[PDB]
User: Fold this.
Amino acid sequence: TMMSVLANALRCIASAERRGKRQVLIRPSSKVVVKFLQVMQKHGYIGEFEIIDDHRAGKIVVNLNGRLNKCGAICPRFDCTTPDFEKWVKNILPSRQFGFVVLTTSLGIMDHEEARARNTGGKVLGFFY
Amino acid sequence: MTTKRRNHGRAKPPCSRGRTRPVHCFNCGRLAPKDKAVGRFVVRRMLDQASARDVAEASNVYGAGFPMPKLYMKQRFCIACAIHSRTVRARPTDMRKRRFTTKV
Amino acid sequence: DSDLSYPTVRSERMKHKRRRLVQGPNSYFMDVKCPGCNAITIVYSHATSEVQCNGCATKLCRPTGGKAMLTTGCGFRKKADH
Amino acid sequence: TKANGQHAARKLVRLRRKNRWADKGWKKSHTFVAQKANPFGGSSHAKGIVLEKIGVGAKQPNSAIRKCVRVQLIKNDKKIIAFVPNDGCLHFIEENDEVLVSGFGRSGHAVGDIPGVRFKIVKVSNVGLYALYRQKKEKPRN
Amino acid sequence: VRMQGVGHGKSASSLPFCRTPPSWLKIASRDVIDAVCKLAKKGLTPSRIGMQLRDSMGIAQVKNVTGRKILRILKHKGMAPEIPEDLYCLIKRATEMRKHLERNTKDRDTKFRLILVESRIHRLARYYKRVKQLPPTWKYE
RNA sequence: CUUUGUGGGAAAUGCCUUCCCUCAACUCACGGCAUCCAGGAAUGAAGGAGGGUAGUUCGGGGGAGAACGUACUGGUGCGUCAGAGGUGAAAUUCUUAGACCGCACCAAGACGAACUACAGCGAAGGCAUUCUUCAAGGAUACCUUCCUCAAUCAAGAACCAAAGUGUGGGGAUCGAAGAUGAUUAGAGACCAUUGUAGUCCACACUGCAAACGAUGACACCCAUGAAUUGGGGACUCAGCACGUUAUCUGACUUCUUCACGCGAAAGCUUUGAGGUUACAGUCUC
RNA sequence: UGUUGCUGUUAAAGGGUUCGUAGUUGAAUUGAGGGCCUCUAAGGCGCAAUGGUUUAGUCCCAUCCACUUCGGAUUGGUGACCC
Assistant:
């Protein structure tokens, strides 16, 4: 089976992006997968997306503008902290300039940049370039 | 080691059988799997052309009267067997991959 | 232009019900008339078992697994899926 | 591969503890059979009493004769061979003289063209043998 | 994937995309209920109750034309079986294999199958004594 | 003791009313009042698992019982007469006490050719005459059922090619060991004629294979073309069977124009060794 | 020794297969609200008005008739649509 929802979604996006395809299908939907997409659509990396309803589990559909290069998943959801933002941001990303790690917090779902700003660490979620 | 042949010299595909019955040779009595073994179909004459004339003379109810029968057989050979009578020969890379199916 | 979000008609004629966008039902109902009287009785396209009425020993449907084979001489009206 | 689970820890630990026994660079440290085997006890040097001078051959690609010394060890009562590592200083070693003994280079493999010998004689009678070779000191027979 | 042994199949039954009752079904909750319980007294399992209903009466789902499905009906009227459907079936198949094997001890296939069916029944058992639906002293044999 | 299908017809300012006047042996309309008596408020039904039903579905799947086929070997009878076996050439070997050979018949044991395939089924090892019989398995079809029952695995359990071991039955063919003749400088050699164990079956052990796809298991994404194998979709074992066009799900594989990519290369390609230094789906060895 | 950050087709290395406990890992749902005023803040696949002779168009029409691949014609025409 699949033991991470995110992993199932963002291996469709990455593959599709490397083939230059301008839409992708996503088999499941979660409250979580939504939030992840939302982020990247603000910062300009996605055109739009639709959630469709089968009344069992939804099928997300996304429009890629080709502005992504990867969307990963950090699977164990390891604990990152106020000092350790530095660590992750160096090690898994090609840059500090345009690398975006996305984290979970009690507050919501947000970029590392906004995480530091509000001074709360948390468990990591995923990342994109 | 190196995969010289994809099908391994067999008409047996991976992940299906893994066992196909042995079959004797009409040369040396060697056994090999049926798929490996080298099939040919002979259609062997019962008379040479030269002699066919002479016998068809003395015939009235045969030859002219009915076309002569032939001995049919299937011949399953071993690898070594085939090669030595040069009915199968080594081929260059591009040609080895070619097949002619079961047609002659 | 083609879209994943809103698919084309010709494409989704083909697809299996487990491969569909919606994943709806692929079956429908029918009104089979009992020719041994006049008794209108609902019957299901993939009945997958015989169905009888007291107006027919002519039966209605055969049990066969591919879809029902309805008895000859019987009036068929096609109800909608929806 | 490996396990990425949160509570996966103990499987990881026990995996490493198994696979370090396939390393010889783990054994050489932790195991005391290695220590025992080494003729110095794993000490830097040891002293010994010269028994006999033994002429030793050489391997096939380089034909030579090599001058070696059969020495006995005071510490453990083991016998060992060692090489005289200067030109014409076989003289300065004599029988029943105390002598020091060292390793040389790689100490798990024998040195080229002298099989079985990893051991070179640094000092004779606590005098530097190099000092005798390139004259500064003279050997005591005192 | 198939639980034990090889198999991938996609043979399945979907749902309607309309969860409200058809216009050609004018039958009320009560009629549906009555039909279920009536049939049940013959000793029919819920699986065949639903089949009888859908085919004859055109019922879309029991759940669509009543507020509850087939077991909930039965339970409330005290006709429900105390041995779940899936468990019972396996035990029947099991015993029948054991007949065949009693006679034929050279039969390789049905032996291996019985081993499967056994451990499968055990999984069910274990389940239904966590989620109480059998006594907590239940065992296959 | 009509009409009796249902909307239709008439008439109003889609709706009302009148009129036809609501069929499945009880169905429709109205009334008495007599009864019985809490019960319909639940998330959903995962291209996640289990179960049900159906096509007399699908298949060298498995067990049992009964027949069938020639051939090999041997025996018997009817005939012929001198060589026959066998090899590179020979010899061992068999023959007037009639071999070889031909026909007929019988005995005993094994096996099921061709058809038989870049096909099928089984968890793997493996599996091929026909008829009957017993219990299964996979695939498909479904608006049936259950509602998280799952995935993978130290421990533990079951199965497992051939050769081997125990006991009993059988012993045609082939055949390790052995014997004899060649070949050779030397030769149970490789070859030839023989021959024991074994080869077969029943009940026990053994679990040792290149048991290989040298590719662990489950899950997601991933393109080009043409086929094949099953199911589904558009009188007499018979509202049948096959084929063509098109579609779909499930299996095995080919492009000897497989796309991207990967790899040291050979090669691998929805069927991964691809999606991996931009290094993290899950588990285990 | 590769948790961060290893490899196992052929180079050292996937267990002959299956079942299966400890152990490890495990799908989706409950839902994170709104209005009035200012702001040239943007977009508009909404829209009353009224503008535009080809100072910009296409359908219809007019004249030809050209067997068939010419056209122009004005107020054309609440038409279409454009700033």
Residues 1-12, 15-16, 19-20, 22-23, 25-26 of chain D lie near RNA strand G (CB under 10 Å from a C1'). Chains D and E do not touch (no CB pair under 8 Å). The beta strands of chain D are 46-56, 66-73, 79-83, 98-103, 119-120, 123-124, 127-128.
